[PDB]
Amino acid sequence: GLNNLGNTSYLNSILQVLYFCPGFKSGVKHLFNIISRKKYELICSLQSLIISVEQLQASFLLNPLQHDAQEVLQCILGNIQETCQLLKKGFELVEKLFQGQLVLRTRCLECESLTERREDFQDISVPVQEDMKTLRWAISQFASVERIVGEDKYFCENCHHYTEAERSLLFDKMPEVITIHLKCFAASGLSKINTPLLTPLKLSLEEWSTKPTNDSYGLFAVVMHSGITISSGHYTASVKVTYEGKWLLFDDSEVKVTEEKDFLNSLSPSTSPTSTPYLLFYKKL
Amino acid sequence: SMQIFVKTLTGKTITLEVEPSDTIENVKAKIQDKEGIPPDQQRLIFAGKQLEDGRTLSDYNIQKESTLHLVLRLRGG
Ligand SMILES: Cc1cnc(-c2ccccc2C(C)C)nc1NCc1ccc(-n2ccnn2)cc1
Ligand SMILES: [Zn+2]
Numbered sequence A: 001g002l003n004n005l006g007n008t009s010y011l012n013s014i015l016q017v018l019y020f021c022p023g024f025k026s027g028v029k030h031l032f033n034i035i036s037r038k039k040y041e042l043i044c045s046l047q048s049l050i051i052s053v054e055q056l057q058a059s060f061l062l063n064p065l066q067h068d069a070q071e072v073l074q075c076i077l078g079n080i081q082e083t084c085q086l087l088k089k090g091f092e093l094v095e096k097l098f099q100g101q102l103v104l105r106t107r108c109l110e111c112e113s114l115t116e117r118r119e120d121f122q123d124i125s126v127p128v129q130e131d132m133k134t135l136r137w138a139i140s141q142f143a144s145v146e147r148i149v150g151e152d153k154y155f156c157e158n159c160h161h162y163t164e165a166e167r168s169l170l171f172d173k174m175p176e177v178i179t180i181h182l183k184c185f186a187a188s189g190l191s192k193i194n195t196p197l198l199t200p201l202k203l204s205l206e207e208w209s210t211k212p213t214n215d216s217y218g219l220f221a222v223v224m225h226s227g228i229t230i231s232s233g234h235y236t237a238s239v240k241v242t243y244e245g246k247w248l249l250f251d252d253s254e255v256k257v258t259e260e261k262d263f264l265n266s267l268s269p270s271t272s273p274t275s276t277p278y279l280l281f282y283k284k285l
Numbered sequence B: 001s002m003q004i005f006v007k008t009l010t011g012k013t014i015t016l017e018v019e020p021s022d023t024i025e026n027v028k029a030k031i032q033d034k035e036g037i038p039p040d041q042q043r044l045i046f047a048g049k050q051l052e053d054g055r056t057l058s059d060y061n062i063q064k065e066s067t068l069h070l071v072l073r074l075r076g077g
Helices: A005-019 A024-038 A041-062 A069-088 A093-098 A135-143 A260-266 B024-035
Strands: A100-108 A114-121 A124-127 A146-148 A154-156 A161-163 A165-171 A177-183 A185-187 A190-192 A217-226 A234-240 A247-251 A254-258 A275-284 B002-007 B013-018 B043-046 B067-071
Touching: A005 A024, A005 A041, A005 A069, A005 A217, A005 A234, A005 A247, A024 A041, A024 A069, A024 A093, A041 A069, A069 A093, A069 A275, A093 A177, A100 A154, A124 A135, A135 A165, A135 A177, A146 B013, A247 A260, A254 A260, B013 B024, B024 B043, B024 B067
Parallel strands: A124 A177, B002 B067
Antiparallel strands: A100 A114, A100 A165, A146 A165, A154 A161, A177 A275, A185 A190, A217 A234, A217 A275, A234 A247, A247 A254, B002 B013, B043 B067
């Protein structure tokens, strides 16, 4: 009868990733208790879903339109955040789990003056190809010094002129969960890039941090998209259990337990996978 | 009036001359003028929030040297 789960595979993948985020369902339970003795429908349906999935997972262990997944994640997280602010006027669940802060610097190449902008972020949108690559290459393309020249000259208020500039991004405040949004799509007209990056199990962003940090990250969830186009396809999710150390493979109605080695080998771009990674999730160690 | 940055699909940064009264549709039209992506396929993220059509940059407090992030939709089902 679960031949209808596939219709919401974007939402299913996002819910399977959020159910295994550390501290997410604890925070949702806390907000649900608050809203209960307040007497919001998103929090209550989230609680109902988490209890249903707890029932199903307890049974498993003992008695064996089409939409974008990142956009659905964004909508759910924004709704939870708004609920938290309203209940505030414990209430910093999204801020502590998924929200970091960037320091964006611009250096004019004429006067060599530095201007800074501070912006929040919930995920990191990195490219997958240039116009075999690793995730380090993509985060460098995101955050290393880029020179903006030509038609994209910077207007410097100090020179009162158009100048070439160097932009660089740095990670200041860090969330507990790092979401890598992979831009696996290109424009000439629009097509999907099926070649994935060489994804690591361990990630360090100290190369692009404002301060020297020893905090490393570990890959625990991957959302993949299957299809030759960007307008249609199927979303799957691979989550790591922290069975602890195994990767659960969610495909519509059937779940597969997997070794970390087999999962990492399936992620390899040398095997040419049909499931293209789209969202990578890294939790602080 | 003010200049903002947009990180494109390849990570390359482009610039835009905009007004605080400009709408997200106008910004998307300028991004199409520079990149060749129709405005209905563009998603713009600023400070973690997706810029909704019909709103203005002033509604989001987008200032000079603010950076938008341009992604597409990867639809699944
Ligand atoms: C078939 C299925 C598909 N989706 C989900 C699911 C999971 C989390 C959040 C949301 C969903 C759905 C409702 C979108 N759950 C499923 N089945 C239950 C289940 C859960 C966990 C395990 N498991 C094994 C070892 N550790 N946990 C085994 C079975
Ligand atoms: Zn200058």
